[PDB]
Design a binder for these strands. Structure first.
Ligand SMILES: [Mg+2]
Ligand SMILES: [Mg+2]
Ligand SMILES: [Mg+2]
Ligand SMILES: [Mg+2]
Ligand SMILES: [Mg+2]
Ligand SMILES: [Mg+2]
Ligand SMILES: [Mg+2]
Ligand SMILES: [Mg+2]
Ligand SMILES: [Mg+2]
Ligand SMILES: [Mg+2]
Ligand SMILES: [Mg+2]
Ligand SMILES: [Mg+2]
Ligand SMILES: [Mg+2]
Ligand SMILES: [Mg+2]
Ligand SMILES: [Mg+2]
Ligand SMILES: [Mg+2]
Ligand SMILES: [Mg+2]
Ligand SMILES: [Mg+2]
Ligand SMILES: [Mg+2]
Ligand SMILES: [Mg+2]
Ligand SMILES: [Mg+2]
Ligand SMILES: [Mg+2]
Ligand SMILES: [Mg+2]
Ligand SMILES: [Mg+2]
Ligand SMILES: [Mg+2]
Ligand SMILES: [Mg+2]
Ligand SMILES: [Mg+2]
Ligand SMILES: [Mg+2]
Ligand SMILES: [Mg+2]
Ligand SMILES: [Mg+2]
Ligand SMILES: [Mg+2]
Ligand SMILES: [Mg+2]
Ligand SMILES: [Mg+2]
Ligand SMILES: [Mg+2]
Lengths: 260, 188, 155
RNA sequence: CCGUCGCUAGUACCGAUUGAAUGGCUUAGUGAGGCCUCAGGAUUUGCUUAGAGAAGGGGGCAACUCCAUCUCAGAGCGAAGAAUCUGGUCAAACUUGGUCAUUUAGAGGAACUAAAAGUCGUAACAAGGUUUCCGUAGGUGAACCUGCGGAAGGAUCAUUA
RNA sequence: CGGCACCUUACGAGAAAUCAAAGUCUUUGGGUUCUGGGGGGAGUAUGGUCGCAAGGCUGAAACUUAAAGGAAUUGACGGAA
RNA sequence: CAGCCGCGGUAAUUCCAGCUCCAGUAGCGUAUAUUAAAGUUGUUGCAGUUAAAAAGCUCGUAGUUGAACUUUGGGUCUGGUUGUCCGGUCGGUUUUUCAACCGGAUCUUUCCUUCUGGCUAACCUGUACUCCUUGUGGGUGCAGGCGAACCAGGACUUUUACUUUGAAAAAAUUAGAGUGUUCAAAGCAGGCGAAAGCUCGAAUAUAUUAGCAUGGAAUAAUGGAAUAGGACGUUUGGUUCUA
RNA sequence: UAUCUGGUUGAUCCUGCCAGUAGUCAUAUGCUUGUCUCAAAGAUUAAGCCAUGCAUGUCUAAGUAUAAGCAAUUUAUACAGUGAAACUGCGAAUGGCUCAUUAAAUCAGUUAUCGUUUAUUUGAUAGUUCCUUUACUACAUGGAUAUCUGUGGUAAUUCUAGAGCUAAUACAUGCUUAAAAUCUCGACCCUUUGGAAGAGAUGUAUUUAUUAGAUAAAAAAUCAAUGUCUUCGGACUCCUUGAUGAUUCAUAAUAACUUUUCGAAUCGCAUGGCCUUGUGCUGGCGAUGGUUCAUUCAAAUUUCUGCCCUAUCAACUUUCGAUGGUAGGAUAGUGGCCUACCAUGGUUUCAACGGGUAACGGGGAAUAAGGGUUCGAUUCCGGAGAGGGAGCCUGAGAAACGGCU
């Protein structure tokens, strides 16, 4: 209506915040950034509801101002900066380096990553075009645009970005039997190998993907992110490791593991 | 005010679509420019996304282009010779896109005199060699030559001057040109 | 329907930005540009061989096929360069647990590549809005004959 | 137990008033206001070397060992630029008509319903005292009668040769 | 083989008279068209439409009312036997 | 008073008061709607001889429906999945004697879409024949060559409906797991230490209309060779090519 | 958490309704009412009318500050501490409210923009402004306007006329910084194998042209143009090219135009490195701007399928765009969106069109065996509207109403 909408109501807020239904009218609208509103995570939600390093919004703001937070090398001061999938949040006091990675259920898991790994960022490939002055450039689904990529870096590949410099360390070619991580819908957060690629002219390229448990599932190509070669992922994944157990199994795990 | 709504326009069938909402700005369409030829005038208009959009008004001159040679020049227009949408634009003489026009041609001639240097209508020793190397490439399609001789080249203007501001067009050649000529003849 | 005259408006029509070089001397003269539409649809030879222009042709023009690909029988061929497809289908109603026989028509642009008659089954690709209602463009007349050659019975 | 004619209430129906009201469309005529547009030029100024009085008006009588010099008559060349304004265009609204919907006064009419005790009949129910119906015409004070044809829900599943 | 037609049991039915279909239906579904939803107001009002008309087809509501019906049972009664 | 049935006409259990007494209880009545009950709107699931209901009759376009017939049967292995046979075991686990059940490959006069090529994995192999219990236990190994082990491009698909699993159907709601808001209605919390730090969570399922995806080929339609202008191909000519 | 009872009757079994019974984040109301948690609440009639007050403004180490303010004292002989006011910026298009319209419209899911704009966002990034090349704007270009202070009008209004100064990331002008390569021009010699001294032009946007942006396999004969190396029989060899299902795509060149956009005369800290010992040439951390390409926030459209009652609406649309075409115009762009010219289409018993809705759509709500039926003004998502209808400014975004006409 009449131009860009500026608020986000707390029910309309995306579920993988894991916000309270109650406790205020609104939720933080993640501002214009390198990630899509619903597939993002603002710095309020991270430092208040997940980590609980700030008891409230004001506290979070204060922390931001203090400038111990750094989402992907640069500093940030905006409460509602959309830090999305693969973004590396480093709090310099604590030295609690994090990478924003999904849990098997779907929500963003707080992955307490080491200092040596929290340095690069793995990122997908959205486009490969040439800009002005005839220079080829790659675009990432995770924000950045990098000039001059190795000619054999094509669409839907993944790219290890040095992050500090904002360059290209290395890449993985998207292909059959190469470790992949899922970022869309019912399979969001799982991890698998890649078996097929149903081509389909226009209407969404599907991908048959099996996990470590030999459990198959299918997703669209845009909802899949190439994380390594089977056995060696390029990033440390959280406990569970994109398996996603059955409900019964989960229950069993819960009520077997009673260690007071 | 002047809108581009498909809200109005009854329907594919015919039912009178009721006035759902008051029409919006994003649906708007401005008043027509219909540029004549009589002193150079331009007015911009701040469009959507800002973005100025020069409206030609009474536009004299524009770079009309050859095909065969691959060139265009700082060339004046004379008159609206034949517009294939509507003949009201020939009485009023309102220059527009794909209207056929007559081109001052002097500039073109001058350019030719540099380019090939053989003259249309009817020094220095190493440049002679260059000249020899060039020329006898394009013989030109008679009508064009005649136009040149006259001082009035037949073109079709192909820049939309109500949008662009510039009045840049195209020297007519071949089949299309012939057709245009025929049409003109029919008219007169 | 209609066709034949080629260059026959108040204006005169070419494939835009595409050039019939008078200096150069080819046999074709008219440099016929053409599009390969894809999605597993062949460019009909009538389009590449012939003469007609059409902005609204998907093989010899600037209209690009994308989005949905419908099919359907043709009801009306009466208007110029466009067809009225009639896309029959069934609508479910759970209170009874049965179906209706429902209608919807589709006015679609036809490139003179194809000969389209009444009662011909026609595959049609979505594209740019061509007109008021015409948002669709014919790519394959499936019933090429439909017992046209084999009409007479006597041996 | 059925009608007519009475009395008392209420519902709607029709209905002259050249009825009244609201809105929706709408003919013709007008047409506010902006937008573009044709001009129009209050004012504001830059650059021209355009002559000063200036007390080193550029580092010592002098085109100042003349300085964005003292600065207005210049005038030329611009740039921006109001009211005002020529045609469009969008078009509110108004004026007077026309029209559809919904409301709503409305003298009178002609109905129907209710109610416990009105009046003249006894139509139907018993072969209800001319058997009932139905269709249809015609009549009558009201049921109703009576033609014609039909039906039995008939007052007969019956007359043999 | 075909249309204008009795008796018993009904296990099939049906409220019952009765029904060899009015059966194969709460053990609910062979294929179709049409019609009805308490009685009255009313086959009216209105508009349509059809007619030379009489009338036809089409077709309300307001309002009113606890019954209106059906089938049979026993009675009572009948200018029925 | 009484929704309705009805009570009232000098013996009211129904009106108006006391006591008793019932029901519900910090609630209970009344009014209108509406859902249930209503199989009194009926697809499931009603009626039409007489209770309301079969057009007086036939014709008839739409619609709705519509007889049966084309691949059935047998073998040969091979994956599971729970009951069995003991717990072979430290109340749980791994096979066999067995089972039904659901697949898969095939072979049966049988093609599952077919090729132009990439990778031919494999040995149908046999080139030297042997590391070696007396052996067809076992593999360094490469000219002919089994292609399904995958692609990456043609060629052209009879087309549906139906059903399969899948991907998408915002959160709140609904269903629903976990959890001592003191209980619950809720809520997304919490939980455990040295009580110096550590730590579980914030699930899952639905929504079937339409589109997308894939398997299935019964059912129902559709389609094809009867002027065969048909199919193939060692055709043999050609004709138009295109390049 | 599948349930039925009273009522025609003299009694009987049905048709059948009435009546009861139960529920309602369904309203009202009548009595009553101690506590804990929870809490809707001028929708229904009048999208009727409104006194008063409030509901959008806002400055940081970092835009401008000689308030003749505060406060003051141990950076100002151009400035430096705080800062009213005002100009610049940005914001006011969100939010909140309400449900009047609106019935294939909105809306739901589903596609698409190869059909477009997109302040903000984070990623990116511009030696070519010069125009003959022996004496020319740079260590900083210009004049305004507001605060103020002063001269006022008015019955009044968030009213602002005149003078005096006075700024800016105001708003205007405007400097540096080439080599190469490629394309148009050019003093002759020496009879061919022909071959060059040297002069001009070439950023980015803008416009139409025009070229490249290739690509299903191997091997020739020779006819016209006739090139390189000739080891003078002749050889010719290594000859470029992204993405998509798909383009006239990305994009790069040739050609011009252009009332030549842009190309940092910008603010806070810090005050380094070489001496050709000038105050020389040099170099850090940041702010804001500014170009198209990304992205993000979005934006218009747009594909498919789906709405409540009505035949006491069967034809409607098409003079006044209906359907399609061609061309233009317009638009950010598609498009009968509008104009011209032509064709006669387009929809419809698979209910078009019309009428009604005490209809905003959906999520959902109530009821609750299964199937259903009714409700959805209302906490979320969309859409509309700001008394009605119209028009427009500013702006990335409004046809805004706590903007204007
Ligand atoms: Mg696509
Ligand atoms: Mg812009
Ligand atoms: Mg006017
Ligand atoms: Mg008698
Ligand atoms: Mg009698
Ligand atoms: Mg009698
Ligand atoms: Mg009589
Ligand atoms: Mg009735
Ligand atoms: Mg008593
Ligand atoms: Mg009901
Ligand atoms: Mg019934
Ligand atoms: Mg009957
Ligand atoms: Mg009858
Ligand atoms: Mg009859
Ligand atoms: Mg059959
Ligand atoms: Mg629950
Ligand atoms: Mg029920
Ligand atoms: Mg009775
Ligand atoms: Mg009784
Ligand atoms: Mg009831
Ligand atoms: Mg109200
Ligand atoms: Mg809002
Ligand atoms: Mg080309
Ligand atoms: Mg291009
Ligand atoms: Mg057009
Ligand atoms: Mg509703
Ligand atoms: Mg309404
Ligand atoms: Mg609603
Ligand atoms: Mg309302
Ligand atoms: Mg809302
Ligand atoms: Mg009001
Ligand atoms: Mg307004
Ligand atoms: Mg207000
Ligand atoms: Mg507002």
């Amino acid at each position: 209506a009449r131009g860009p909408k500026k608020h986000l109501k707390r029910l309309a807020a995306p579920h993988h915040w894991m916000l309270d239904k109650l406790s205020g009218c609104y939720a933080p609208r993640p501002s214009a950034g390198p990630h899509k509103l619903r597939e993002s995570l603002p710095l309020i939600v991270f430092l208040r509801n997940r980590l609980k390093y700030a008891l409230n919004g004001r506290e979070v703001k204060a922390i931001l101002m203090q400038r111990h937070v750094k989402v992907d090398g640069k500093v940030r001061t905006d409460t509602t900066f959309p830090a999305g999938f693969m973004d590396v949040i480093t709090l310099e006091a604590t030295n609690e380096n994090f990478r924003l990675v999904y849990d098997v259920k779907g929500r963003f898991a707080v992955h307490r990553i080491t200092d040596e790994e929290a340095s690069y960022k793995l990122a997908k490939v959205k486009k490969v075009q040439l800009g002005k002055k005839g220079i080829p450039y790659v675009v990432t689904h995770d924000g950045r645009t990098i000039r001059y990529p190795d000619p054999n870096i094509k669409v839907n590949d993944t790219v290890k970005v040095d992050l500090a410099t904002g360059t290209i360390t290395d890449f993985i070619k998207f292909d059959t039997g190469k470790l992949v991580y899922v970022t869309g819908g019912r399979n969001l957060g799982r991890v698998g190998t890649i078996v097929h690629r149903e081509r389909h002219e226009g209407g969404f390229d599907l991908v048959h993907i099996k996990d470590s448990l030999e459990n198959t599932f299918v997703t669209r190509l845009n909802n899949v992110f190439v994380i390594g070669e089977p056995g060696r992922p390029w990033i440390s994944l959280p406990k569970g490791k994109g398996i996603k157990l059955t409900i019964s199994e989960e229950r069993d795990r819960r009520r077997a593991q009673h260690g007071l | 005010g002047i809108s581009r709504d498909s809200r109005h326009k009854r329907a594919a069938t015919g039912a009178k679509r009721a006035q759902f909402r008051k029409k919006r700005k994003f649906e708007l369409g401005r008043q027509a420019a219909n540029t004549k030829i009589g002193t150079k005038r331009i007015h911009p208009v701040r469009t959507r996304g800002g973005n100025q959009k020069f409206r030609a008004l009474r536009i004299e001159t524009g770079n009309f282009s050859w095909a065969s040679e691959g060139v265009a020049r700082k060339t004046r227009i004379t008159g609206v010779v034949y517009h294939p949408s509507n003949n009201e634009l020939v009485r009023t003489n309102t220059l527009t896109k794909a209207a056929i026009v007559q081109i001052d041609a002097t500039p073109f001639r001058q350019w030719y005199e540099s380019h090939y240097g053989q003259s249309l209508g009817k020094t220095s020793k190493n440049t002679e060699r260059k000249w020899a190397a060039r020329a006898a490439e394009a013989k030109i399609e008679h009508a064009v030559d005649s136009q040149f001789g006259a001082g009035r080249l037949y073109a079709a203007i192909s820049s939309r001057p109500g949008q662009s501001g510039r009045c840049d067009g195209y020297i007519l050649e071949g089949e299309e040109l012939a057709f245009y000529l025929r049409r003109l003849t029919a008219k007169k | 329907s209609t066709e034949l005259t080629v260059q026959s408006e108040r204006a005169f029509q070419k494939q835009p930005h595409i050039f019939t070089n008078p200096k150069a001397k080819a046999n074709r003269k008219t440099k016929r540009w053409y599009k390969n539409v894809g999605l597993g649809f062949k460019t009909p030879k009538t389009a590449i061989e012939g003469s007609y222009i059409d902005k609204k042709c998907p093989f010899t023009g600037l209209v690009s096929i994308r989005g949905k690909i419908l099919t359907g029988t043709v009801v009306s061929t009466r208007m110029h360069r466009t067809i009225v497809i009639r896309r029959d289908y069934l609508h479910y109603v759970p209170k009874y647990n049965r179906y209706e026989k429902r209608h919807k028509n589709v006015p679609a642009h036809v490139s003179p590549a194809f000969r389209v008659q009444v009662g011909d089954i026609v595959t049609v690709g979505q594209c740019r809005p061509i007109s008021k209602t015409v948002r669709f463009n014919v790519l394959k007349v499936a019933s090429a004959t439909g017992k046209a050659n084999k009409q007479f019975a006597k041996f």
